[PDB]
Amino acid sequence: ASFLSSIFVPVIGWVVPIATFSFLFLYIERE
Amino acid sequence: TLSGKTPLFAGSTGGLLTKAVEEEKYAITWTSPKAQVFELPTGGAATMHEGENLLYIARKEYGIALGGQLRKFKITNYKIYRILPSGETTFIHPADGVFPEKVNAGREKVRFNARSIGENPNPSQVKFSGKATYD
Amino acid sequence: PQQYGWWAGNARFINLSGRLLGAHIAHAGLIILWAGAMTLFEITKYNPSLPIYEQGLILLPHLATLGFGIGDGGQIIDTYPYFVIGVVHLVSSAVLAAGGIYHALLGPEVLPENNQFPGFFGYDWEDEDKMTTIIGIHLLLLGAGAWLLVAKALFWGGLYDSTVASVRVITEPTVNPARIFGYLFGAFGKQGMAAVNNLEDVVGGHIWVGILCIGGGFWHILTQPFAWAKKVLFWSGEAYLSYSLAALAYMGLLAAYFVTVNDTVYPTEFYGPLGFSSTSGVISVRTWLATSHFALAIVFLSGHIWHALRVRVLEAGLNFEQGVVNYLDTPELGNLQTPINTSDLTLKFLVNLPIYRPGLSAFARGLEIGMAHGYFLLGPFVKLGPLRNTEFANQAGLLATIGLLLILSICLWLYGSAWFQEGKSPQGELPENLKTAKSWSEFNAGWIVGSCGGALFAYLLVTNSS
Amino acid sequence: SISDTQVYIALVVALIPGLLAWRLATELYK
Amino acid sequence: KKARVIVDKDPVPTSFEKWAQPGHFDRTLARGPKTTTWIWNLHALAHDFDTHTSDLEDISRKIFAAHFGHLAVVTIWLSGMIFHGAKFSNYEAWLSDPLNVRPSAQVVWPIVGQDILNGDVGGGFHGIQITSGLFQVWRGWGITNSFQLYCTAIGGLVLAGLFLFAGWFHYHKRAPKLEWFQNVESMLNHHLQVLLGCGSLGWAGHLIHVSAPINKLMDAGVAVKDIPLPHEFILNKSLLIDLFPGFAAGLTPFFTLNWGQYADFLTFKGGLNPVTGGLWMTDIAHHHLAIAVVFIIAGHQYRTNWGIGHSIKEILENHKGPFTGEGHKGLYENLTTSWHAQLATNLAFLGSLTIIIAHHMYAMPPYPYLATDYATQLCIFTHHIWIGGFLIVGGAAHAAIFMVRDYDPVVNQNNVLDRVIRHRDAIISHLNWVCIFLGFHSFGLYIHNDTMRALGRPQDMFSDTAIQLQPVFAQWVQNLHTLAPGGTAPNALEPVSYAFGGGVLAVGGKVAMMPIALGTADFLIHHIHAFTIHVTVLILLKGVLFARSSRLIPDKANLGFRFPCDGPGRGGTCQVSGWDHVFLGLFWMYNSLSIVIFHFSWKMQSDVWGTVDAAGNVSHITGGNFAQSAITINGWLRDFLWAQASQVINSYGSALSAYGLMFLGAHFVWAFSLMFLFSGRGYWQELIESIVWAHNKLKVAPAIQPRALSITQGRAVGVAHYLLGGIATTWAFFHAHILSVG
Ligand code: CLA
Ligand code: CLA
Ligand code: CLA
Ligand SMILES: CC1=C(/C=C/C(C)=C/C=C/C(C)=C/C=C/C=C(C)/C=C/C=C(C)/C=C/C2=C(C)CCCC2(C)C)C(C)(C)CCC1
Ligand SMILES: CC1=C(/C=C/C(C)=C/C=C/C(C)=C/C=C/C=C(C)/C=C/C=C(C)/C=C/C2=C(C)CCCC2(C)C)C(C)(C)CCC1
Ligand SMILES: CC1=C(C/C=C(\C)CCC[C@H](C)CCC[C@H](C)CCCC(C)C)C(=O)c2ccccc2C1=O
Ligand code: SF4
């Protein structure tokens, strides 16, 4: 189960920020 | 419609940015009795021409500031124009040809409150309403 | 002419051919005088007990390497060859002196241009053929001079060799192009052309230089300069001077590097130990030659720049009174015109970058930009990453690069998505074919493909460095 | 410690407040 | 026209009337106080003479008289230092034993137990150990007894008296006209030739006739009582001949250009005297002679009354090129009509010079027994760096004051000053960038290193044992200066400084000076200096270039030099004034110089200073920990601040206890400053309202209505206490540490 750390920590570190900042950027610039 | 030659030594990095092309631009015209040096709104010693001068400016505050400096040169015939990207020039100062500090008949009171400032309502009174306490 | 002050007095006869000629023969004479007179000056105070390198004799080392009166172990046994050479120059100086003072003021101010033989020597800075022929004419004499060194190295005695410390005759010159030109490509050492370690490559080098100079000699006298040369170069008389100064500066630095590191063509028995060495407090001949000609190369580079920038200002139709800093034809605009932002070189370069270059599709722009950025971005990740000192240094670096380029691809998609909102075109200095949502998608597709490719290509070159 | 199965159940059970947190957040935005 | 003495007689009648009329000098202040703001304004405007009167002649007279005042107080101070040396010091004991006795010239009175501060300083004397280097100055002067100091002190009090009289006389009695003041060519001639040239010739005289002989005998181990008095070397030539044979030749070799006959008392030795570890007096003699000649020649450049000479206006006007339009035309008028333009220049370059002096004095310790007095070395370096930094920021302030008040567009049209104003956005944008670049690629390397060390990855650090950043250029320059003697300086025996290279020079057991090797820690700290200087310049240059106007406030010159803002509009215009850029530049000057003196302190203690074994092995004060520690912030926190603060925090119940109290006191004053900097006037005026209510309630409300400090004064008080507190902390730290280990 320890292997989940190798999946989740990179996701919370990179995937989640990129996805969140990408969406929020597109939302705050929507006209 | 804007007549006047651009003053000598009018060049600097403090001039018009992309806003002047995209949003809005201002011009200030004035008739000088004599060619004389004046400080530009955004730095640099420019030279007025004898006769009609036209200076493009990013902000209306540049015009009013320069206007104040032209008054020190005994010049009170300066006109500020707002210019839109469609080339819609609008004369904006002095609005009615008379300077705003001088009283002119025809002008109506705008945003006048017929009360002392102490007589404004409390914020609680105008809560969840559209109106503010200074309305 | 008359606008130039006495301090810039030699600029008065730029357009006057006679004075300019007379000045060149006169200065030639001055170089000959020095070469000849200082050879005698050095002969007069040669102590055969003490070595040459710590006496302060510069020309005798240059005569010594040619193998003029030396026995075994680089020992100067006879000095008559130094005297005969010294006097030959010193008399040639007096003949060139005469020629100098004649063409200066006694001769005509302008060399006449006509169909007669005296007419040939006359020239104009605009007629490009006549200068090209003069380039070729004097190139034949550079070739001749290189073949005279070869003849000295092969037939007339030979050259001094530091391997056996004797004056061996050269018989088998290296006529292999791959070997001799390999020096230009840094094949046989990090030092390049200054990494020569035998006379066989030196004679071989001067064969190749000899035939190239003679080959170029025939070319330039029999051909006029083509339309591509007609556009890229400046054609004022001061433009040619600035080019020649760039060459002299390059040659000065070349010889300064040679004398510093090379010991074959500059023997340690004459010039002294390699690098910068001082024996018994006395500075070695090598150090003097190296450091002087390094300093003169920096000065002659400063001369190239000065004379080149002056040409570029004059040809732009700018004077030095109003200057090189102007306004944008609309003074009240932000920017100023400067040689950094408005120079034809700057404008031509920027316009021709893939982002601005006419006739490139949105994809092709992205692709070229991608390839360039993807290529150079590999370096830092490979060579400074956490796995840089492991077997996975290149592979780690490549995956990092692809990684960064994928986030940069998302950044592009975000930038486009933000701006392209049904009709409203993006602000900023875009090309006309990147002002639609589909064109921007193509540009992003271009970037991705380009950047991945550029990275992959750098990786294939890095991993196959063998 | 706890089994790999128990960790996988917890993650699947954690999708429930994950879903409902999304639904509440979207409803609170209106 | 001709330079001549032209004065008005009895321009200002002397009377105590105006002494009884506080704020007489300003028309606004003359009406009297209504609020407590008046009391501040009085002091704030006191010496702002441009606001007193419009007349440039009256301003020039006030400035000339004030200077005689400042010369008088500086002479009183220098006389006091020498008097305290004569009366309340162990100078004579210290002469007999320089290496063992500790210099002290301040004795504390026995009251409330403060006599503890009178520590055992050696020479059977109890007092505060001094770090001003006065003993090393007086030894260099060739002073050998208390009587010579008494004479010098009294002489000073007479000179201070003369300076007071001069200031009163040249204001109240015979005040020069503006014509006099504007003779810049005559002033430069007299100040180059007499003040500097004849001062340096005069001093060469003293060195050659008094200092060199007396010091030579003291270095030969002759007892102070046995050494002849300085006049005995003039009256009895035989004594001087014995030390310097060249005096046998007399003055004829000077007039016949046989100057080699003086090679024994006018030397170019280089390095340091091995006895004292200071520069050779004979080198210093020849220096001051050579300086004197170059100055006396230099000060015949400017035309006065005889046609020969340059006019500075013509020089300036002629220096223009194809980038700079009219070039330096109009700058002569700026510098001869504005006192602020001169004060800007003189503060900028005197400040820059004081920092050069700091560097040159540690590397080439000019005084005998200075190099080994590690307390003096650290303190005079730090002192002169601080004075330098304040003067430079003053330069920028008065440059901005000039731009707001004294700048004329007509004089300065298409000149270098006009043209810098026209690309000020290009200047500040580029300087902004280079500041961020230097910040990332200097400080970011420390953060990289801290993180790598913390993650247990020392191989990934920027260090000598990891990814190296060798300062190859500084390393190459050190080598050139080390090879100079015999090579590119043939007539030099040693290098100018052992810092560049050569050997470790040691006096007593201790290292006077040795080569200061540069590596990754030296590369990193140098790029921190570059960063912190470029950011200070960004702030100050932005202050001067945007003082008159900006894209935000077009009419900023009308608001003046010192105004708090132009209101919360335009998003908020807090601290746009040239004054507020000086305010922000002071913090960055403080930040910059703090890291400079910390760099010096740690580098010298780890890599230079220390004891020398008989074999010749150097044991440094902090055992060369700089290379591995000074490459992380944690290393600075631990091995510098934490480690070396042990002496100051453990000083209570000893003679260094005062530094322990100063250390806390300074930490307090610093923290107190944050009240002024972080808060605003609005809060304090509203609090004062309630306090005023209570005073009104008990009928003790003052007629002079209490006001919260002005927005500008709030900031001025803030930065004052911040600098005082911060600098005083380091001062207490440095002393307590270096008076224990050094
Ligand atoms: C929060 C989570 C997080 C995680 C899990 C990581 C993980 C990593 N970082 Mg760190 N980093 C982070 C936050 C994070 N970072 C932040 C906030 C900063 C700024 C303070 C940094 C600053 C930093 C620096 C300066 C460096 C790292 C490096 C690394 C790698 C070192 C391991 C190694 O030596 O193998 C070697 C591993 C590789 C060479 C890369 C493996 C493949 C990459 C991760 C992705 C491949 C493409 C991917 C499939 C798709 C696109 C990318 C993305 C959208 C997912 C590792 C992948 C080092 C590195 O190697 O950079 C690339 C490195 O130099 N990080
Ligand atoms: C700010 C300066 C700074 C610098 C220079 C470095 C440098 C480095 N870091 Mg460190 N780091 C820093 C701050 C810094 N760090 C900070 C603040 C942290 C957070 C605490 C870290 C945390 C960290 C981690 C966790 C790791 C690193 C690592 C590294 C190394 C590899 C990084 C890499 O591959 O990036 C690649 C860089 C680029 C792709 C950008 C290159 C920029 C180019 C060269 C600019 C070119 C401009 C050009 C000259 C101008 C135009 C050219 C013209 C022709 C047009 C490298 C030595 C890694 C390592 O392994 O250490 C050895 C690693 O694992 N760093
Ligand atoms: C520690 C305290 C601190 C710090 C870090 C800063 C930082 C800065 N100041 Mg400030 N300043 C400070 C105190 C500080 N100041 C105080 C107390 C005052 C009141 C006097 C000021 C007043 C002031 C003025 C008047 C000016 C500055 C300016 C600057 C900037 C200079 C440019 C630079 O170096 O950029 C580089 C950035 C740094 C050195 C910060 C650290 C960088 C880290 C190590 C790298 C990034 C790591 C990583 C990528 C982080 C993100 C990842 C994460 C989100 C996952 C810089 C951002 C100047 C400026 O803006 O000019 C350019 C300027 O003119 N400051
Ligand atoms: C000095 C100078 C300069 C220069 C510099 C630089 C900029 C450098 C860099 C460089 C670089 C930056 C380069 C680059 C290159 C690149 C390359 C060479 C690429 C390649 C690529 C490829 C070939 C690819 C391929 C592919 C693709 C695309 C896709 C698919 C896959 C493949 C692989 C097939 C300039 C001009 C600015 C200016 C003047 C001065
Ligand atoms: C420390 C002090 C002091 C003291 C001081 C003193 C004591 C000083 C002095 C000074 C001096 C004592 C100086 C002098 C000088 C001099 C000079 C500067 C001279 C010059 C000369 C010359 C220049 C010459 C010339 C000539 C002639 C005449 C003839 C022949 C020729 C000739 C050229 C050689 C006092 C008390 C104030 C207090 C404070 C501190
Ligand atoms: C504390 C603080 C105050 C309050 C401080 C004030 C009003 C200063 C008052 C202190 C002095 C020392 C009062 C002196 C009064 C008498 C002269 C003392 C007479 C008694 C002596 C003779 C002993 C501000 O006004 C302020 C304004 C703007 C920004 C920040 C701040 C800020 O931080
Ligand atoms: S907060 Fe203070 S400084 Fe800022 S705008 Fe308001 S009054 Fe002015």
From CA B91, how far away is CA C17, in angstroms rounded? 65
Q: Are E54 and E62 in contact (CB under 8 A)?
A: no
From CA E593, how far away is CA E726, in angstroms rounded? 11
CA of E635 to the centre of ligand 2 (A): 22
From CA B66, how far away is CA B64, in angstroms rounded? 6
At position C86, the amino acid (one-letter code) is G
Neighbour tally for B126: CB within 10 Å:
15
CA of E455 to the centre of ligand 1 (A): 15
From CA E64, how far away is CA E7, in angstroms rounded? 13
Lookup result for tokens 């990934």: E460
Long-range pairs of C375-380 with CB within 8 A, sequence gap ≥ 24: C375/C454, C375/C455, C375/C457, C375/C458, C376/C454, C376/C458, C377/C401, C377/C404, C377/C405, C377/C451, C377/C454, C377/C455, C378/C455, C378/C458, C378/C459, C378/C462, C379/C458
Closest to C8 in 3D by CA, of C313, C323, C306: C306
From CA E140, how far away is CA E280, in angstroms rounded? 10
From CA E562, how far away is CA E577, in angstroms rounded? 6
Neighbour tally for C433: CB within 10 Å:
16
Instruction: Determine the residue of E427, E434, E435 to mutate for testing ligand 3's pocket, defined as the one with the most ligand atoms within 8 A of the Cβ atom.
Output: E435
Lookup result for tokens 């370069």: C349
Neighbour tally for E457: CB within 10 Å:
13
Protein residue whose Cα sits closest to atom 37 of ligand 5: E156
Long-range pairs of C254-258 with CB within 8 A, sequence gap ≥ 24: C254/C193, C254/C194, C255/C293, C256/C289, C256/C290, C256/C291, C256/C293, C256/C294, C256/C297, C257/C191, C257/C194, C258/C193, C258/C194
* Cβ neighbourhood burial of E360 (10 Å; 0-12, 13-18, 19+): middle
Q: Are E124 and E93 in contact (CB under 8 A)?
A: yes
Lookup result for tokens 């006009």: E418
Q: Are C278 and E487 in contact (CB under 8 A)?
A: yes
At E650, which CATH number?
A: 1.20.1130.10
At position C311, the amino acid (one-letter code) is V
Tokens matching residue A28 = 């705050």
φ and ψ of B105, to 5 deg:
-65, 145
Q: Taking the alpha carbons of C243, C245, C246, C252 in that order, is the dihedral positive or negative?
A: positive
Resolution for the entry shown, Å: 2.6
- The closest CB to that of B14, out of E413, E414, E551, belongs to E551
Q: What is the CA radius of gyration of chain A?
A: 13
Q: Are E620 and E608 in contact (CB under 8 A)?
A: yes
What's the Cα-to-Cα distance from C434 to each of B25, C168, C407, rounded to whole Å?
27, 70, 21
- The closest CB to that of B15, out of C326, C334, C427, belongs to C334
Q: Are A1 and D4 in contact (CB under 8 A)?
A: yes
From CA E52, how far away is CA B97, in angstroms rounded? 41
**How do C278-279 and B51-57 pair as beta strands?**
unpaired
Cα C103–chain centre separation: 32
CA of E439 to the centre of ligand 3 (A): 8
From CA E79, how far away is CA E583, in angstroms rounded? 34
- Return the ligand 5 atom nearest residue E202 CA: 15
At position E729, the amino acid (one-letter code) is T
Q: Are C182 and C151 in contact (CB under 8 A)?
A: no
Dihedral Cα B4, B6, B7, B12, nearest 10 deg: 150
Tokens matching residue E37 = 């703001």
Residues 6+ apart with CB under 8 A from A1: D3, D4, D7, D8
At position C459, the amino acid (one-letter code) is Y
Neighbour tally for E37: CB within 10 Å:
18
For chain E, the straight-line distance linking the first and the last C-alpha, in angstroms and rounded, comes to: 59
Residues 6+ apart with CB under 8 A from E226: none
Range list of H helices, C274-392: 285-315, 344-352, 362-384
* CA distance to partner chain E, nearest, from residue C326 (Å): 10
Q: Is residue B33 within 8 angstroms of chain E, CB to CB? A: no
Closest to E380 in 3D by CA, of E85, E132, E605: E132
The total number of residues written for chain B in this structure: 135
Q: Are C207 and C173 in contact (CB under 8 A)?
A: yes
Q: Are C192 and C132 in contact (CB under 8 A)?
A: no
> Which subunits sit against A, judged by 3+ Cβ pairs under 8 A?
C, D
Q: C107 by DSSP, 3-state: which?
A: coil
Nearest CA in chain C to A22: C414
From CA E26, how far away is CA E21, in angstroms rounded? 11
- Return the ligand 7 atom nearest residue E568 CA: 5
- The closest CB to that of E554, out of B42, B44, B45, belongs to B42
Q: Are E721 and E673 in contact (CB under 8 A)?
A: yes
Q: What is the CA radius of gyration of chain D?
A: 13
From CA E591, how far away is CA E726, in angstroms rounded? 10
E 558-597 near B (Cβ less than 8 A): 558
φ and ψ of E314, to 5 deg:
-65, -40
Q: Is residue E322 within 8 angstroms of chain C, CB to CB? A: yes
Cα E351–chain centre separation: 6
Q: Are C190 and C174 in contact (CB under 8 A)?
A: no
For chain C, the straight-line distance linking the first and the last C-alpha, in angstroms and rounded, comes to: 60
From CA C34, how far away is CA C86, in angstroms rounded? 9
From CA C69, how far away is CA C270, in angstroms rounded? 13
**How do E126-129 and E104-106 pair as beta strands?**
antiparallel
From CA E293, how far away is CA E296, in angstroms rounded? 5
- C–E touching, 3+ CB–CB pairs within 8 Å: yes
Report how many helices (DSSP H) and strands (DSSP E) chain C contains, helices first: 14, 2
Q: Are C369 and C450 in contact (CB under 8 A)?
A: yes
From CA D11, how far away is CA C89, in angstroms rounded? 96
Residues 6+ apart with CB under 8 A from C379: C458
Q: Are B59 and B26 in contact (CB under 8 A)?
A: yes
**How do E119-120 and E126-129 pair as beta strands?**
antiparallel
Q: Are E564 and E718 in contact (CB under 8 A)?
A: no
From CA A31, how far away is CA C70, in angstroms rounded? 91
φ and ψ of E612, to 5 deg:
-125, 115
From CA E502, how far away is CA E481, in angstroms rounded? 10
From CA E202, how far away is CA E212, in angstroms rounded? 14
Please tell me if the CB atom of residue E78 comes closer than 6 angstroms to any atom of ligand 5. Answer: yes
φ and ψ of B89, to 5 deg:
-70, 130
Q: Are C74 and C165 in contact (CB under 8 A)?
A: yes
From CA C169, how far away is CA C185, in angstroms rounded? 29
From CA C132, how far away is CA C220, in angstroms rounded? 5
* Cβ neighbourhood burial of E698 (10 Å; 0-12, 13-18, 19+): exposed
From CA E697, how far away is CA E693, in angstroms rounded? 6
Buried b (16+ CB within 10 A) or exposed e, E657-678: bbbbebbeebeebbeebeebee
φ and ψ of B96, to 5 deg:
-110, 20
Q: What is the 3-state secondary structure (H, E, C) of E358-399?
A: HHHHHHCCCCCCCCCCHHHHHHHHHHHHHHHHHHHHHHHHHH
Closest to E230 in 3D by CA, of E246, E221, E217, E249: E217
| Chain A environment of D29 (Cβ under 8 Å) | none
Total domains in chain B come to: 1
What's the Cα-to-Cα distance from C286 to each of B91, B96, C249, rounded to whole Å?
79, 86, 19
- The closest CB to that of E409, out of B13, B37, B62, belongs to B37
Q: Determine what percent of chain A falls in helix, strand and coil, rounding each to the nearest 5.
A: 80, 0, 20
DSSP-derived secondary structure for C429-466: S--GGGSSHHHHHHHHHHHHHHHHHHHHHHHHHHHT--
φ and ψ of C403, to 5 deg:
-45, -60
From CA C66, how far away is CA C199, in angstroms rounded? 11
φ and ψ of E462, to 5 deg:
-85, 95
Q: B53 by DSSP, 3-state: which?
A: strand
C 328-367 near A (Cβ less than 8 A): none
Total domains in chain E come to: 1
- D–B touching, 3+ CB–CB pairs within 8 Å: no
Q: C327 by DSSP, 3-state: which?
A: coil
DSSP H or E segment with residue E126: strand E126-129
* Cβ neighbourhood burial of B57 (10 Å; 0-12, 13-18, 19+): buried
What's the Cα-to-Cα distance from E706 to each of E24, E268, E676, E702, rounded to whole Å?
22, 66, 17, 8
Technique employed here was cryo-EM
φ and ψ of E104, to 5 deg:
-145, 130
Q: Are C83 and C36 in contact (CB under 8 A)?
A: no
From CA E605, how far away is CA E586, in angstroms rounded? 28
CA of E160 to the centre of ligand 5 (A): 19
Cα E243–chain centre separation: 37
Of the bound ligands, which one is closest to the alpha carbon of residue C379? 2
CA of E708 to the centre of ligand 6 (A): 7
Buried b (16+ CB within 10 A) or exposed e, E703-719: eeebbbbbbbbbbbbbb
From CA E670, how far away is CA E590, in angstroms rounded? 12
Closest to C125 in 3D by CA, of C137, C138, C115, C111: C111
Range list of H helices, E562-653: 578-607, 626-629, 633-635, 643-644, 646-649
Beta bridge partners, B8, equal: B47
| Backbone torsion region of residue C158, taken as left when φ is above 0, otherwise alpha when ψ lies between -120 and 50, otherwise beta | left
From CA E599, how far away is CA E580, in angstroms rounded? 29
A 1-31 near D (Cβ less than 8 A): 1, 4
- A–C touching, 3+ CB–CB pairs within 8 Å: yes
| Chain C environment of A18 (Cβ under 8 Å) | 407, 410
Q: Is residue E460 within 8 angstroms of chain C, CB to CB? A: yes
At B121, which CATH number?
A: 3.30.1470.10
Detail the DSSP E strand segments found in E156-286: 174-176
What's the Cα-to-Cα distance from B45 to each of B39, E335, E522, E597, E648, rounded to whole Å?
5, 19, 46, 43, 57
Closest to C296 in 3D by CA, of C252, C245, C262, C326: C252
Tokens matching residue E694 = 């209570």
Q: E520-545 and E374-405 are packed helices; what angle lies between their axes, rounded to 10 degrees?
A: 30
Dihedral Cα C323, C328, C333, C335, nearest 10 deg: -60
At position E348, the amino acid (one-letter code) is A
Structural domain range at position B41? 2-135
From CA C48, how far away is CA C75, in angstroms rounded? 8
Q: C16 by DSSP, 3-state: which?
A: coil
From CA E15, how far away is CA E13, in angstroms rounded? 6
Protein residue whose Cα sits closest to atom 2 of ligand 7: E574
DSSP H or E segment with residue E241: helix E237-243
Q: C282 by DSSP, 3-state: which?
A: strand
**How do E610-612 and E618-620 pair as beta strands?**
antiparallel
Please tell me if the CB atom of residue E161 comes closer than 6 angstroms to any atom of ligand 5. Answer: no
Tokens matching residue E374 = 């590690």
| Backbone torsion region of residue E238, taken as left when φ is above 0, otherwise alpha when ψ lies between -120 and 50, otherwise beta | alpha
Structural domain range at position E440? 1-742
